[PDB]
C-alpha cells in the first residue's frame, strides 16, 4: 500500500578540481531513473518514468536539476574554501530526498544530507538545519545556505507539492510493474558446519517478486526453530534472492524439507524434500 520514492545523490570531491555527482531514483524497490555524471540529462529506466508529467513539465523539471547539479558542485567547492582549514578534501556528500505516499492524499517529504557518511543536515519546513550530533562548524554553511531565499522557495515547492504530485502519477503509470508477481524457484544444498560432526543445509530461493516471502526448514509439519534466513539479495532482473540455512547432525538430513510461501504461487507452496 505505502511506497517510498527516493532520489539518491552521491557526490565525491577528491580535491579542489576533481568531482562527480551521480544519482539513482527508486519507487519502492524498483529503479525509475539514473543520472550519471557523464550525462547532460536524466535517464528513464522504465517506460513509465515520466509519470503523468507532460513533456513541457518534465523538460522544466530536468532544466531545474541541470542548473542544480552545476550549482551544487561550485557551492560545495566554495563552502570548503570558506571553512578552510577545518575541512579538507576528500569529501563525500550524499542526499536522500523524496516522499513517502500514504492512503488518500497523505504524504510526507524529506531531504536528508550526509557528510563523510554521517547524516548531518536536513531541510525542514522553510530552511536548512543541522540534526542532533552534527558538528558545530556546520552552523556557518547553514547560515550561508539559509541566506538563499530563491533556493528555499524552490525546495519548499519540490518537497511540498512537486514530489507528491509527481509520485501519484508515477504510481498510476507504473501500476503493472509495481504489482507484478514473479515466482520463486527453490533448490537445496549442504556444507560442513563451524563444528565437526554438524552439517549446514541451505535452501536457496530465487526469482521472486515482490519481496515478502516465507521460508522454513521443516520435518513433516514441525517448523525447525533453528532456521536462519539470510538477507534479501537482488537479482539483476529486479527479482529477489533469499536463502534459509539450518545446522543439523550429519545423518539427520533425511525427512527434512524446505517450504516456501509466496504471493505469486496462489497457495501452491513449494516443498523440497532432502
Amino acid at each position, epitope marked *: 500500500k505505502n511506497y517510498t520514492f527516493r532520489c539518491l545523490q552521491m557526490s565525491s570531491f577528491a580535491n579542489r578540481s576533481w568531482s562527480r555527482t551521480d544519482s539513482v531514483v527508486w519507487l519502492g524497490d524498483l529503479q525509475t531513473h539514473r543520472w550519471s555524471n557523464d550525462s547532460a540529462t536524466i535517464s528513464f529506466t522504465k517506460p513509465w518514468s515520466q509519470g503523468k508529467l507532460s513533456n513541457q513539465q518534465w523538460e522544466k523539471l530536468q532544466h531545474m536539476f541541470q*542548473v542544480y547539479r552545476v*550549482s551544487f558542485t*561550485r*557551492d560545495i567547492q*566554495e*563552502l570548503v*574554501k*570558506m571553512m*578552510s582549514p577545518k575541512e579538507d578534501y576528500p569529501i563525500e556528500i550524499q542526499l536522500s530526498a523524496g516522499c513517502e505516499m500514504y492512503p488518500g492524499n497523505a504524504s510526507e517529504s524529506f531531504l536528508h544530507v550526509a557528510f563523510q557518511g554521517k547524516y548531518v543536515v536536513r531541510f525542514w519546513g522553510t530552511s536548512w538545519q543541522t540534526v542532533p550530533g552534527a558538528p558545530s562548524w556546520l552552523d556557518l554553511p547553514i*547560515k*550561508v*545556505l539559509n*541566506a*538563499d*531565499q*530563491g*533556493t528555499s522557495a524552490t525546495v519548499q515547492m519540490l518537497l511540498n507539492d512537486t514530489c507528491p504530485l509527481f509520485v501519484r502519477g508515477l504510481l498510476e503509470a507504473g501500476k503493472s510493474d509495481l504489482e507484478k508477481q514473479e515466482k520463486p524457484v527453490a533448490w537445496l544444498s549442504s556444507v560442513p558446519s563451524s563444528a565437526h560432526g554438524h552439517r549446514q543445509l541451505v535452501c536457496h530461493v530465487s526469482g521472486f517478486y515482490p519481496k515478502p516471502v516465507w521460508v522454513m526448514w521443516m520435518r513433516g509439519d514441525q517448523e525447525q526453530q533453528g532456521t536462519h534466513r539470510g538477507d534479501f539479495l537482488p537479482n539483476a532482473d529486479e527479482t529477489w534472492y533469499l536463502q534459509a540455512t539450518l545446522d543439523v547432525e550429519a545423518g539427520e538430513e533425511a525427512g527434512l524439507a524446505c517450504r516456501v510461501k509466496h504471493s505469486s504461487l496462489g497457495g501452491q507452496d513449494i516443498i523440497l524434500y532432502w
Partner: T-cell receptor
Framework: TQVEQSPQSLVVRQGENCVLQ??????????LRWFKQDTGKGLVSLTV?????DKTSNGRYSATLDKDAKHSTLHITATLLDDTATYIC?????????????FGAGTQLIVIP | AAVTQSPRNKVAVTGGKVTLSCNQT?????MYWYRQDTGHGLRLIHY???????EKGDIPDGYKASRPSQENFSLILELATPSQTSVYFC??????????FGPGTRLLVLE
C-alpha cells in the same frame, strides 16, 4: 562576455527620457543590479531586481527584468545634467555570498544642459 | 555598511612593491578585490572568507592577497608592472549576496 550593455554610449538633452539595456547569458541569474558611476567616482546602487518578471522604481529611475529573456532595461525620466555618468549592469549568480557578480562594461550617458 | 580604501591614488614605478589596503568595521566575514579597466566590467582578482583565508579570483596573476584580520584585506603587487595601471575596488559582505563597495583606488605604474 556574459553581460552586455547597449547602447555603448549616448548623448541626450536635458528633459528627454532614455532607455538603457542589459542582456546577459549568466546562469543561474538570481538578481540584477544597476549602478551609477560618476566620472572618477564609485558605484552607487540605483535598484536591484530579483523576480522572474520584475519592475522597480526609484525617483526618476525605473527598471524591468525578464529572466526568461535575460533582459533588463533601465529608464531615466526627465534627464538632468547630473545624470551624466556611466551606468553599469551587474548579475549575481546566487542568492548568497556563494555568488559571483558578473559586471557589464557600462553605458556612458551625456546629458546636455 | 561602510568600506574604506587606502591610498586613494598612487603613482608607482615598474618593479616596485605596492600595497592596496581595504578596511571595514562591519564585522563582515567576506571581502573581495576587483579592478576596473575601460572596455571591461569589474573583474575579480582575489577574495577572502575570513582572517587567514585568501582565494584566487578570475585574474589573480601578478597579485598576492592578505587577510591579517577580519577588518583588513590587502592587495600586494610585489613586482608592479604598467599593465597593473587600473582603478581597484574592494568590497565586503556577510552571508547575503550584497557586496558593499569601497570608493576605489587609482594606481599608475610608470616605467
Amino acid at each position: 562576455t556574459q553581460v552586455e550593455q547597449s547602447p555603448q554610449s549616448l548623448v541626450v538633452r536635458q528633459g528627454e527620457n532614455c532607455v538603457l539595456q542589459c542582456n546577459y547569458s549568466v546562469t543561474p541569474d538570481n538578481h540584477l543590479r544597476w549602478f551609477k558611476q560618476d566620472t572618477g567616482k564609485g558605484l552607487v546602487s540605483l535598484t536591484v531586481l530579483v523576480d522572474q518578471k520584475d519592475k522597480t522604481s526609484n525617483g526618476r529611475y525605473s527598471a524591468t527584468l525578464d529572466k526568461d529573456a535575460k533582459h533588463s532595461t533601465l529608464h531615466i525620466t526627465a534627464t538632468l545634467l547630473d545624470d551624466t555618468a556611466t551606468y553599469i549592469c551587474v548579475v549575481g549568480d546566487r542568492g548568497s555570498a556563494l555568488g559571483r557578480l558578473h559586471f557589464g562594461a557600462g553605458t556612458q550617458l551625456i546629458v546636455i544642459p | 555598511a561602510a568600506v574604506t580604501q587606502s591610498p586613494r591614488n598612487k603613482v608607482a614605478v615598474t618593479g616596485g612593491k605596492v600595497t592596496l589596503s581595504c578596511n571595514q568595521t562591519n564585522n563582515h566575514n567576506n571581502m573581495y578585490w576587483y579592478r576596473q579597466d575601460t572596455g571591461h566590467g569589474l573583474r575579480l582578482i582575489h577574495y577572502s572568507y575570513g582572517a587567514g583565508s585568501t582565494e584566487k579570483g578570475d585574474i589573480p596573476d601578478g597579485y598576492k592577497a592578505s587577510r591579517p584580520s577580519q577588518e583588513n584585506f590587502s592587495l600586494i603587487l610585489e613586482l608592479a608592472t604598467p599593465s597593473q595601471t587600473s582603478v581597484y575596488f574592494c568590497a565586503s559582505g556577510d552571508e547575503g549576496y550584497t557586496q558593499y563597495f569601497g570608493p576605489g583606488t587609482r594606481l599608475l605604474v610608470l616605467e
